Structure formats: C-alpha cells, structure tokens
Amino acid sequence: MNPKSLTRGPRDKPTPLEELLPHAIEFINQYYGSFKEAKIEEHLARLEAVTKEIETTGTYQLTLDELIFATKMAWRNAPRCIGRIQWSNLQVFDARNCSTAQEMFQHICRHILYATNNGNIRSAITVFPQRSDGKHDFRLWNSQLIRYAGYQPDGTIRGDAATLEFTQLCIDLGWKPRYGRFDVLPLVLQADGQDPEVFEIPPDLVLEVTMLGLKWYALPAVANMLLEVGGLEFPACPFNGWYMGTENVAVLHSFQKQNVTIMDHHTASESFMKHMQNEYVLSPFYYYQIEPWKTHIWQN
Amino acid sequence: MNPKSLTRGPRDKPTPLEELLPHAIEFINQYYGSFKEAKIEEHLARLEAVTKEIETTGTYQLTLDELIFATKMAWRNAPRCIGRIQWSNLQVFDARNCSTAQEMFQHICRHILYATNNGNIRSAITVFPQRSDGKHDFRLWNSQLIRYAGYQPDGTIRGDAATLEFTQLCIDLGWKPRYGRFDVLPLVLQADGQDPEVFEIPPDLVLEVTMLGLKWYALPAVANMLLEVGGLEFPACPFNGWYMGTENVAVLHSFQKQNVTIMDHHTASESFMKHMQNEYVLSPFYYYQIEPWKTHIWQN
Ligand code: HEM
Ligand code: HEM
Ligand SMILES: Oc1ccc(-n2ccnc2)cc1
Ligand SMILES: Oc1ccc(-n2ccnc2)cc1
PTM comment for this protein (chains A, B)? Predict the structure, then answer.
C-alpha cells in the first residue's frame, strides 16, 4: 500500500518555484478542462500570466472563479464526506484580503449568520489568505466554529470530552470558564502568524436545538483544515454542512420539530435535486493540520 | 543481584483485577503526589472512580493528563537515555481511539511531520490503544519509524545490517525490494491483533542529511517498545528524540550545515534551559518486547 498522508504541516519558507509551478500548471489544466473543448486560448493566456507571476512574485493569486471551483472540487474529493454528493451546493466567502484577527472574527460572524439561516442550513466556506512563507499563517485554533467546552477530579468530563485540551488552552488564554454542560467555546483566532486572540461568539449567533436537559447546536462547521490547490495552501478555511441524524430518535425528532436541517431522506433528495439543477494524490484537497498550540512560537 | 527483566511479553488474557488494582492505586498516588500537598479530595475521588471502573469493566482509562505525566515519567525512568535530562520537552499524541492500520498510518504520518519539523527536531510520542486481552494488540513491527533496508552471496550486507531479518519479512509480505544502500523500509502496522499491513512512507516525509555517497535520515524514532503505567500496557507507542553526534566529523558537520538538530553542546544547553523553564521495579517504564513476527498467529 502507498497511501498519502492526510495531514499537511507547517513551512518555514515559501514553496520553491520548481515545486509550485508544476502544481499550478496542473490545476489550471483541471480548471479549463472543466470547459471541455472551449477556451483553449484563454487556458494558454492564463498559463502565461500565472507563470510570470510566480517567477516575479514567488507565488500567484487564484481568480475568484478558480477559487470557487477549487473549494468545490476539494469537497468532491473528500473521501468520507457524505455531503459531497451535492458538491455544487456551496456558498463561497472570499476573505483573502483579511489582515487582522478582528476582521477574521467579523468574517466568521457573517459565515455563521449565512450558514445557520434561522435553521434552514446552507453550506458555506470562508477562505482566508493563503500561506506565504509559512511564518504568517492565518489559523483558527478551534476544531469547529461552534463546540461546547469540556472540563475534567474523578477523571470524568463535564461538557465535550473532545475539547478538554482546547478548553484548557482558552482558560490559559484568559477566557473565563463557566462549568456548565453546554458552554460554547470562544473563537481563538490567529492572523498573519501573530499570537491568537480570543473572541466570544455572540450568543444570538448560536442556534441550538433543545432535545432531561439535553441540548445541541444546529451548525456543524469544521474550523481547522487546510485547502490545497495548485500548490497553494490555505491554512484557514472554515466550512460547514448540516448534521447527519446519526451523529438517537429524540435528536431526529427535535431538529425536525424545530425546523433545523438534517440529512434525512427528504433533505438528501432535495439537495441532490438542487445539485443536479446546477448541472446546466488528489488535488484540490482538504488536509488535516497539526494542532497549532503544538507548533506555535509565542511572540509573548 | 536481583535485576528486573527489561522485556515485557504478550498475554492471552486480561490482567487479573487483583494484580491490576494495586498498580493503578500506586500510579494514581504518584500522579497526585506530584502536586505535593494539594488535591487530596481529588486524589481520593479518582481512586474511587478508577476502582469502580476496574471492578465493572475489568480495566480502566487514564485521563489525558495522567497519560502525559506517565509518558514523561517513563522517559525520566529510562536508564540509558541521555535525553531524559529534559524529560518535560515531550509532545504527546493521543491515538487511544485508533481502530485500523490505515488510521495507525495516518497517526504516524502526523508524528513524523511534527517531530521532523523541517529539521528543527521536536521530541514526541504517539500512544495507541492499551492492551486489553492481549489478543487485540496494536504493534509496530518496525524497530524504528525510519530505517534503511538491509540486504544479504558473500555474506556481506547492503544497507542496514541490523534490519536483515525485518527486511526479509517485508519482502515476504509483498513489499517490492529495491537493492540500494538507502532504501527506507515500509511501515508494518498491526491493529487490533490482526495480520500486519504494509505502508510505504511518503518519501517527502523523510528528511535526510547528505554527508562519497553517504547519507542518513534526520529522525531517530523507536517504534517497538511498550509503555507500562498503573498496570496498563501500551504495546504501540512510537517516540523520537534527536541524534547524538556520535551515533564522525563529517556527520556532525553535515547535520549542523543542513540545520538538523543534534545533541551538540548548544542544543544540550538550550533544551535543558527549556526544560527548566517548564518547571514553573520502576514504573511507569518503557519495556522491550519480543519481535512480533516470532509470536504472531497469522489469520491468513
Ligand atoms: C451539506 C452537508 C454535509 C454533510 C451532510 C456532510 C457530512 C459529512 C460526514 C458524515 C462526514 C464524515 C465525518 C466522520 O468521519 O465522522 C464528513 C466529513 C468531511 N466533510 Fe462533509 N458534509 C457536508 C458538507 C461539507 C462541506 C460543505 C465540505 C467542504 C466544502 C465538507 C468537507 C468534508 C471533509 C473534508 C470531511 C472530512 C474528510 C473526509 O471526508 O475524509 N463537507 N462530512
Ligand atoms: C530529545 C533527544 C533524545 C536524546 C538525545 C536521546 C538519546 C538517547 C540515547 C543516546 C539512548 C541510548 C541508546 C543506546 O543505548 O545506544 C537513548 C535510549 C532510550 N531513550 Fe532516548 N533520547 C531522546 C529522547 C527520548 C524520548 C522522547 C524518549 C521517550 C519518551 C526516550 C526514551 C528512551 C528509551 C526508553 C531508551 C532505551 C532504554 C534505556 O534508556 O535504557 N528518549 N536515548
Ligand atoms: O466535528 C465535526 C463537525 C462538522 C463536520 N462536518 C461538517 C461538514 N462536513 C463535516 C465534521 C466533523
Ligand atoms: O535505533 C535507535 C533509534 C532511536 C533511539 N532513540 C531515540 C530516542 N531515544 C532513543 C534509540 C535507538
């Protein structure tokens, strides 16, 4: 077996041109090939401009349309994603001009607003600036945009056991811990390679389904993966879908009763129909990363 | 003399409760004693929960923090390890929820990525699921994560003489032998007691220092030892440090010239300083095991 690593790690220098160029050329071919027999002269013109740009700046910028295509192909290329059957139902937010953690926060607020849509969940991805030298990365330190804290004496955990470590990190970063079963964690946002800053999510932005005391948030958003395309790496690119029912009877009932989208049969059929409507190593690809608190060099 | 065996062998049944319990109790004491005079009520609460768990499930689970403490104390307890002077400089990856060999492979990929760190080596250990009945062991059959193959007519060996036997095993397992001096061996990974599966390491994951033709890999990682803690046994727990210069002038020069960490005086001083920064029979312990191809019962 020759599996590939599903993880893409940090860099300390820009991707070498002899490495970047072949990957860019190949992505551009994939993009223009999606037009089948059309746009040969456009394809060649784009190859030229991208090459000059790489040779002159050391890197290159995707067009918006190339970016959109890439986010959708990367989704189509996600082996375990059940939602990838309707990969054309994806809203893209272009945050590649983002500079600060405060601005990252506002972009994420918009994403959560749009995607949650009062319960009528819509799939979205927000793409922050691409990796340059690897010393100025944008990262979300959260695993998901919305997730409950987990607190550890008897060895048992209150909250989400999966967030024990990250929760402790937020505390260490000055976040004030409640100790409930359902405390929504703050966003921990890193911009331009700087130390991360901590932002509470406005509670009204968090839609929850009450199930006994049980409760859960409506929006499943992956915060911590990296988008690769044409040799470019985007270490900050949160995306969301909607929940599968499986990840109990009460749950399937409560989401449906509160009108929050889940992947039931009707939704599967509806979203696939909408997908077919739009019809009028793997790359690009979403990689896992190393948890950033294990690799970050603190400014202070 | 009453030396202890440095080897810990296989089991065919779970550790008996009358044996496990005293060891768990003692480890918990060691863990809470590291808090000196604090957390007496927490200590007692943990003793209770661990005992009930052992009595009800036949075993118990460490908290993440207990696991981390154990990996570091086991390192501190390693008699021949020169690096143990800075035992607090250890990154822990928790893979105790691993199920398959494919997943083991991805965890090891992450470990190699993190630890190699483009040459700025960082010490890490990845802990796979603990032994249950001894019939579902996770094992790495390699002695090191990265090591060159050794090929034997005149009785001389091409490659690493220390891997003659394991190399032959990989071939028997269907791995296609080149016959160079520096062929990186595949990972041979056993999950849940099943027959091992063979995985080529992605070449880009392997950092090498070119010294004449001489060459060598940057990352020294022990693949085949067992971590013991509180009566629990972890038969798969690869860890790495960085090389000592001694294990030639050209070598010390080439690593330093390519910026790959070795235990020179500066590094010794730097890592010890970082260690002191963190300051704000033996158990736990790393045991040797019997080479698994000598004990494994083939499913097919
Ligand atoms: C519209 C609803 C969607 C559904 C129902 C869905 C469902 C899932 C499920 C069930 C998994 C597997 C998780 C596990 O292993 O337990 C998954 C993984 C994943 N999803 Fe989605 N997803 C959706 C949208 C998206 C979107 C919009 C993207 C990205 C543009 C995406 C990218 C991924 C990736 C990269 C993974 C993990 C890697 C892998 O699949 O191997 N998904 N998704
Ligand atoms: C950071 C750099 C490190 C250095 C320079 C270092 C160096 C060494 C050396 C020189 C040996 C002796 C090998 C021989 O006998 O020829 C050794 C053995 C060993 N090391 Fe390390 N080591 C490091 C990190 C680690 C880590 C991270 C662990 C585990 C968490 C570890 C655990 C051991 C064990 C168990 C042995 C063999 C048993 C024994 O010491 O008797 N070492 N190490
Ligand atoms: O913990 C999570 C959350 C959301 C996930 N997801 C959303 C869309 N696709 C996967 C996956 C895993
Ligand atoms: O053959 C090896 C490789 C690495 C080793 N090591 C790494 C860290 N500590 C020991 C020891 C022996």
Answer: Polyubiquitinated; mediated by SPSB1, SPSB2 and SPSB4, leading to proteasomal degradation.
Q: How was this structure determined?
A: X-ray
Residue B89, SS3? coil
Distance CA A115, CA A124 (A): 6
Please tell me the distance from the alpha carbon of residue B111 to that of residue B93, in angstroms, as a whole number: 8
Cα A281 to Cα A77, A227, A228, B65, distances in angstroms: 10, 14, 11, 37
Integer angstrom CA distances of residue A72 from A54, A75, A115: 24, 5, 16
Check the CA dihedral A241-A244-A245-A246 and report its sign.
negative
Resolution in Å, one decimal place: 2.1
> Cα B253–B256–B261 angle (5° rounding)?
135
Q: How many CB atoms lie under 10 A from the CB of residue B85?
A: 12
Element (H, E) at A74: helix A64-76
Cβ neighbours of residue B283 closer than 8 Å, sequence gap 6 or more: B23, B26, B27, B77, B228, B229, B230
Where chain A is discontinuous (C–N > 2.5 Å), the residues before each break are 152, 211, 247, 280
Q: How far, in Å, CA of A138 to CA of A100, rounded?
A: 9
Are B177 and B163 in contact by the 8 Å Cβ rule? The answer is: no
CA A148, distance to chain mean position in Å, is: 18
- Concerning whether B81 is annotated as a catalytic residue, the answer is yes
Q: Are B142 and B243 in contact (CB under 8 A)?
A: no
- Rounded CA separation B38/A33 (Å): 66
Distances (CA, A) of B122 to A14, B114, B218: 21, 7, 11
Residue A220's closest CA among A115, A91, A82? A115
Cα distance between residue A52 and residue B89, in whole Å: 45
Under a CB-based contact definition with an 8 Å cutoff, are residues B266 and B256 in contact? no
Of A205, A183, A202, give the one whose Cα is nearest residue A115: A205
- For residue A232, the cross-strand partners are A229
* Ligand 4 near B241 CB (within 6 A): yes
Six-digit token string for A86: 């309707």
Token pair 């390679």 in the structure block, residue = A193
- CA triple B133-B288-B198, angle to 5 deg: 70
Return the number of other C-beta atoms located less than 10 Å from residue A147's C-beta. Answer: 21
Q: Write down the H helix ranges in A194-284.
A: 249-257, 265-278
Q: Do the beta carbons of residue A240 and residue A123 sit within 8 Å?
A: yes
Q: Dihedral (C-alpha) B245, B209, B190, B125: value to the nearest 10 degrees?
A: 50
| DSSP letter, residue A205 | G
State whether the beta carbon of A290 lies less than 6 angstroms from ligand 1: no
Give the β-pairing of B221-222 and B215-217: unpaired
Instruction: Provide, as residue numbers in chain B, all residues whose Cβ is less than 8 Å from the Cβ of A3.
Output: 102, 105-106, 199
Q: What is the DSSP letter of B120?
A: S
- Adjacent-strand bridge partners of B232: B229
Q: How far is the CA of B81 from the centre of ligand 2 (A)?
A: 4
